[PDB]
């Protein structure tokens, strides 16, 4: 069944901060992509059974992290990449405010 918009609402109302993260990640989607500490875009090569992570283009095999995002988003982000707008994903920060 669809846990819809109309309900994301009703739960936000309740506080249920991580049970909301379950129905959206465990109980559907969910993933494991490899991103980059430079190009904020799922692009590195996951040769795990060998532990070789590369992101040629920005030639580095060190600055490399890992994420738990919905396949959907993953898509949305590949889709935005075709229309040529890079949605770099970062884990550091620089605002604060």
């Amino acid at each position: 069944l669809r846990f819809g918009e109309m309900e994301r609402d009703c739960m936000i109302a309740h506080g249920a901060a991580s049970f909301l993260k379950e129905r959206l990640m465990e109980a559907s989607d969910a993933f494991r992509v490899h991103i980059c500490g430079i190009c904020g875009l799922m692009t590195v090569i996951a040769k795990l059974n060998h532990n070789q992570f590369e992101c040629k283009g920005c030639d580095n095999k060190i600055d490399i992290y890992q994420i738990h995002i919905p396949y959907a988003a993953k898509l949305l982000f590949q889709e935005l990449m075709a229309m040529n707008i890079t949605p770099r994903l970062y884990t550091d920060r620089s605002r604060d405010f």
Binding site: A16, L41, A46, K47, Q66, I85, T86
Partner: protein, 532 residues
């Protein structure tokens, strides 16, 4: 699942929106898109070194990627590229490509009006985001010449009434010229570092020069799969062959014999394929059809459904339920009568802990077909161990730390629901109470907050897969917890119909009970003090 990855696991903190350098593309790319044929070396179930997995990802479930040697369920997709024969407008930046031709000298490429001019030095400090853009536009679209110095800023030519007639830019001079992309970019490329920065751009993430597409991102198969209907590629696959067919023709037109009025059309058709694959609800246009309209990226992402209002701000969920809902005087407020057949198929991860192990081993050793059974059970190697079938389902003594997806049983933190669903009071949690017949059964006095009734109404049911979430649903979204509504700061539940209709029949002093019947009443109160 997915395999372990010795990478740092973090979460996402910033989301840096940028624009693809035509050179980031040419770089991050595995191979080079050339042929428009899908995986037809030979109609053979093997792909082709032109399009579709030249190292971009595999299409058949039983083969690996020719780059990341992983197995589809954990190969996310790789990007390639197509080199364009002549630069092209981006369907979306179009008006805001003009809107900066409307702001710089299309010959030497410095701001029309610079640090001299009261409303330019006053716009030029609007440190607000792009509002300084807008004001720098309105206050530039008019000055149609450069300057020698004026009461020295260099060229001194003149600017055109640039206006947009579908996909292309025309520009008069009082002599009528049409703006060519191969020029417009060379005016942007020559825009000065200071210029686009106060104007509305960025020194690395979004140069303006890159609202002109020179290199094209080739999204991989997961974006645009194929399905066995012998197969059948995806609207975005076919379109890109049309682009790589609309490109090639133009590649050679401008190579062997160059007859101006031939290349003039196929480049305004290549920029038609490029533009149509991203937007397809354009201003005029024909709405390119696929021997039919044709899905466009933009429309996939659109509201209503489509990644944003459909596949993220909302999705569907495993572990969910449904049925006719009837109502039960012999039940408690905070529990919900879920039928067996849901409880036999409604699982729930549970860890192996000395406090229950002596229980889980009786459920396993029960099974999927019995009320308090189990439908799987997960070892440390984490491989799914199906009860329903596995030989060893017989014995299998459990090991601590394991997880036995078992059957949801009485009093379990459930997320219950009705569907209009526009407020908290209509997504309360309950205790389970597994019962017969196919119908959800709920206490008459939690009708209202859902505005539900017993004449055809289904209702939803969820089930947390953890512990903390159960706590979150027990200590926050409980039925008794929400007995008084914040909205109207009054109690949102209460006695109704039969109970209410006759509770006043009873609270008459015309209304008397005799010896026998009284006790029967007393007993029924589950917290009676047993004093007559």
């Amino acid at each position: 699942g997915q395999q372990y990855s010795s990478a740092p696991l973090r979460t996402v903190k910033e989301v840096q929106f940028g624009l693809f350098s035509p050179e980031e593309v040419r770089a991050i790319s595995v191979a080079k898109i050339r042929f428009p044929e899908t995986m037809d070396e030979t109609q053979t179930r093997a792909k082709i070194g032109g399009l579709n997995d030249p190292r971009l990802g595999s299409i058949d479930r039983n083969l690996k990627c020719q780059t990341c040697q992983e197995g589809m369920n954990e190969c996310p997709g790789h990007f390639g590229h197509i080199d364009l024969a002549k630069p092209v407008f981006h369907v979306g930046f179009i008006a805001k490509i003009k809107k900066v031709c409307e702001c710089v000298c299309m010959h030497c490429g410095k701001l029309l009006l610079d640090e001299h001019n009261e409303l330019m030095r006053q716009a030029l400090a609007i440190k607000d985001s792009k509002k300084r853009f807008a004001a720098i536009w309105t206050l530039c679209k008019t000055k149609m010449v450069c300057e020698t110095d004026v009461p020295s800023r260099g060229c001194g030519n003149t600017q055109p009434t640039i206006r947009k007639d579908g996909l292309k830019l025309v520009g008069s001079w009082k002599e009528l010229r049409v703006l060519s992309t191969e020029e417009i970019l060379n005016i942007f490329k020559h825009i000065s570092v200071k210029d686009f920065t106060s104007l509305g751009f960025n020194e690395v993430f979004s140069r303006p020069e890159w609202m002109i597409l020179t290199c094209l991102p080739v999204p991989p198969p997961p974006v645009r799969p194929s399905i066995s209907f012998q197969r059948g590629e995806d609207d975005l696959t076919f379109k890109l062959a049309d682009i790589l067919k609309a490109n090639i023709s133009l590649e050679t037109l401008e190579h062997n014999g160059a007859p101006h009025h031939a290349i003039e059309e196929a480049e305004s058709l290549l920029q038609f394929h490029v533009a149509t694959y991203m937007d397809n609800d354009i201003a005029g246009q024909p709405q390119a059809l696929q021997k039919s309209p044709v899905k466009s990226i933009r429309a996939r992402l659109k509201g209503k459904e489509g990644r944003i209002r459909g596949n993220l701000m909302g999705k569907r969920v495993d572990f969910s339920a449904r049925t006719v809902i009837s109502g039960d005087p012999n039940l408690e407020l905070d529990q919900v009568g879920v039928p067996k057949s849901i409880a036999k198929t409604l699982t729930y991860p549970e860890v192996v802990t000395p406090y229950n192990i002596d229980r889980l081993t009786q459920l396993v050793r029960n099974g999927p077909n019995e009320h308090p059974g189990a439908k799987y059970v997960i070892r440390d190697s984490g491989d799914r161990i199906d009860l329903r079938y596995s030989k060893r389902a017989g014995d299998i003594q459990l090991q601590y730390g394991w997880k036995v997806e078992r059957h949801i049983m009485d009093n379990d933190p459930v997320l219950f629901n009705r569907q209009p669903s526009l407020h908290k009071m209509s997504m309360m949690a309950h205790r389970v109470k597994v019962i017969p017949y196919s119908t959800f059964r709920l206490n008459l006095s939690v009708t209202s907050p859902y505005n539900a009734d017993f004449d055809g109404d289904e209702m939803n049911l969820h089930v947390p897969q953890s512990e903390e979430t159960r706590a979150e649903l027990s200590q926050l979204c409980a039925v008794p917890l929400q007995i008084v509504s914040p909205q109207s700061n009054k109690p949102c539940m209460g006695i109704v119909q039969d109970t209410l209709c006759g509770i006043r029949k009873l609270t008459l002093r015309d209304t008397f009970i005799e010896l026998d019947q009284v006790l029967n009443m007393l007993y029924w109160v589950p917290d009676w003090d047993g004093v007559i």
